């Protein structure tokens, strides 16, 4: 019926000056563009249809052609940046923003979706969507007493589109836009739908990916406890963005990092640092490395939560990328820690898995490991116990690795390797 029309016929109907013939041809265009197998986006663009579709967004007396043209334009805008640009260049942003207030919820939702595709192209189109005024009416759709009264799909699309207005950098979204969105975003982050929770966390993750002033806007809204709860979710599509966000926040100030600790995040890391998904393990170890770069009382809280044995475990066996973050987390621990903290590392078994990694290739990890070894030896001295550590390094076959490191392209490796063999 409207199935498998040629572009030629679509064009004839759209050019017919009969609104009902235009509707059938727009539907036939929508069905072609709905096809997962290479939709003919470029053929539709070349046939000159975008400006007609945009004019159809304004036909308030024919809501079905508003819907069909919004859907066809959504799927053109879902393509490449050139394809999204064709939609923007036809005037679609203000026309979609006017449809946010449509009394037809399926049409309002389609306009939300299209504006998400447009804003998801990048920061320039995101900011252009913001400048045309999209935030006020999007937020008004969510200004209800209880989110649970909205249709599940409508809520998910609105959250997803808001997340694209939080996304991307160079520049980051305008500060006033972020402040305007946050209260609603924090409400979505307490909702019970797993897809809404996941997309909300992705949005918070985008907002905390930046300077400490961006982190602070977020932290000051009280989201860290809910992030910590979500970090314990069963569903990995929630854990993954919750963990990204927490990891971003601890790149900030010692005081922002302490909000994460105070909220209980460390108690989740036994699971995170043994998580069967490699990416979770890796991101959890990276986060640990920015916590052990904190204050000594923060290091002490790492120790108290029992996490030093979990870092030994990762050094001992993990994906090579995860092991390298573990090495960083240890080097940072040794650099900022007390003598008592540093010796505890050796008591937990750090030496042997550290040495076994000296036989790696990536020169960076060797420099990171060697810096830790040195920092540990310097703590041994303060106690008069360097010989005991020297023996350890020998019985595990460390010296063997350390000596051969002198034979390394990066003479920095060669420099440190030799210097240690010397003094010890």
């Amino acid at each position: 019926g409207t199935v498998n029309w040629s572009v030629e016929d679509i064009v004839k109907g759209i050019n017919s000056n009969n609104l009902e013939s235009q509707l059938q041809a727009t539907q036939a265009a929508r069905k072609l563009l709905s096809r997962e197998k290479q939709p003919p986006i470029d053929n539709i663009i070349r046939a000159g249809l975008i400006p007609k579709f945009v004019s159809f967004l304004g036909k308030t007396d024919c809501s079905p052609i508003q819907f069909e043209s919004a859907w066809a334009l959504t799927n053109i805008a879902s393509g490449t940046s050139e394809q999204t640009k064709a939609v923007v260049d036809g005037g679609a942003i203000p026309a979609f923003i006017s449809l946010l207030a449509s009394p037809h919820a399926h049409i309002s939702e389609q306009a939300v979706w299209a504006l998400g595709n447009i804003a998801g192209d990048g920061s320039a189109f995101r900011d252009l969507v913001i400048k045309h005024g999209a935030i006020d009416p999007l937020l008004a759709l969510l200004a209800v007493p209880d989110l649970s009264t909205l249709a599940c799909g409508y809520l998910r699309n609105l959250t997803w589109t808001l997340s694209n207005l939080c996304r991307n950098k160079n520049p980051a979204p305008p500060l006033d836009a972020v402040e305007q969105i946050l209260p609603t975003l924090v409400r979505l982050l307490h909702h019970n739908d797993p897809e809404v929770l996941a997309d909300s966390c992705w949005a918070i993750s985008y907002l905390t990916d930046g300077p400490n002033e961006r982190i602070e806007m977020v932290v000051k809204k009280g989201v860290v406890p809910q992030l910590v709860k979500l970090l314990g979710a069963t569903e990995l599509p929630i854990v993954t963005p919750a963990l990204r966000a927490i990891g971003n926040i601890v790149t900030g100030t010692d005081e922002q990092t302490q909000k994460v600790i105070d909220a209980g995040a460390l108690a989740v890391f036994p699971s995170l640092l043994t998580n069967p998904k490699t990416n979770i393990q890796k991101e959890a170890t990276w986060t640990m490395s920015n916590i052990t770069a904190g204050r000594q009382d923060q290091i002490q809280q790492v120790v108290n939560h029992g996490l030093v044995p979990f870092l030994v475990g990762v050094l001992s066996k993990a994906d090579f990328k995860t092991q390298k973050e573990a090495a960083w987390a240890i080097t940072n621990y040794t650099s900022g820690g007390t003598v008592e903290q540093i010796v505890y590392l050796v008591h937990c078994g750090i030496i042997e898995p550290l040495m076994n990694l000296l036989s790696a290739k990536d020169t960076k990890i060797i420099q990171v490991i060697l810096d830790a070894i040195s920092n540990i030896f310097q703590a041994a001295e303060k106690l008069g116990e360097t010989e005991k550590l020297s023996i350890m390094i020998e019985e595990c076959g460390g010296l063997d690795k350390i000596e051969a490191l002198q034979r390394h392209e990066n003479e920095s490796v060669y420099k440190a390797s030799l210097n240690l063999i010397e003094k010890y």
Binding site: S34, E36, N75, S78, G120
Partner: peptide, 9 residues
Amino acid sequence: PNTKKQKCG
């Protein structure tokens, strides 16, 4: 997370 989404139904 997807930057863009096609509507297929």
